[PDB]
Amino acid sequence: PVKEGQAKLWFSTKEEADAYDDKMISNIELKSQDYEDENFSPVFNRKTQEYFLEPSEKFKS
């Protein structure tokens, strides 16, 4: 199910919000590394966390 967090959406009603989740979920393609799975991908496995470029501690120091 959808997990809530600090970063919220930008929709007024709940129907607009639920429609956005349905659009995003219907585009998800699971890529698992374990055999005997309907979504199995030894190579070309996608990450589930987006990388963000930030100034490190050595940068600002």
Partner 1 sequence: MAFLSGSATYDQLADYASYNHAMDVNQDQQAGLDSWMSEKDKNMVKYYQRSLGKKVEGI
Partner 2 sequence: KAPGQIYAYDIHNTHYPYVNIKQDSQTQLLASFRRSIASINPFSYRQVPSQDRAAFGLRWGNAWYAPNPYPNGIHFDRVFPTHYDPLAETNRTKANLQLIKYAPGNYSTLVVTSEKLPRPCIRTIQNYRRCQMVNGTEKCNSEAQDILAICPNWALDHMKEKVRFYTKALAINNQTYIRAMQVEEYNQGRTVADVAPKTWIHGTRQHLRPDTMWADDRYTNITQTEINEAIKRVEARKAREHEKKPVEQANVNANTGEQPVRVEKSLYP
Partner 3 sequence: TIFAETWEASEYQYRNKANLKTLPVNHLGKLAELKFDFVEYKAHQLIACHLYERMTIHCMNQYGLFKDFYRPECLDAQYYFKTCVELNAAYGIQKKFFPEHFVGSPYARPVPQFQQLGL
Ligand X SMILES: CCCCCCCCCCCCCCCCCC(=O)OC[C@H](COP(=O)([O-])OCC(O)COP(=O)([O-])OC[C@@H](COC(=O)CCCCCCCCCCCCCCCCC)OC(=O)CCCCCCCCCCCCCCCCC)OC(=O)CCCCCCCCCCCCCCCCC
**Where does this chain bind partner 1 (CB under 8 A)?**
23-24, 26-27, 44-51
38 binds ligand X (CB under 6 A): no
Residues 6+ apart with CB under 8 A from 29: 39, 46
27 binds partner 3 (CB under 8 A): no
**Cα–Cα dist 7/29, whole Å:** 23
Nearer to partner 1, 47 or 58 (CB): 47
Nearer to partner 3, 6 or 56 (CB): 56
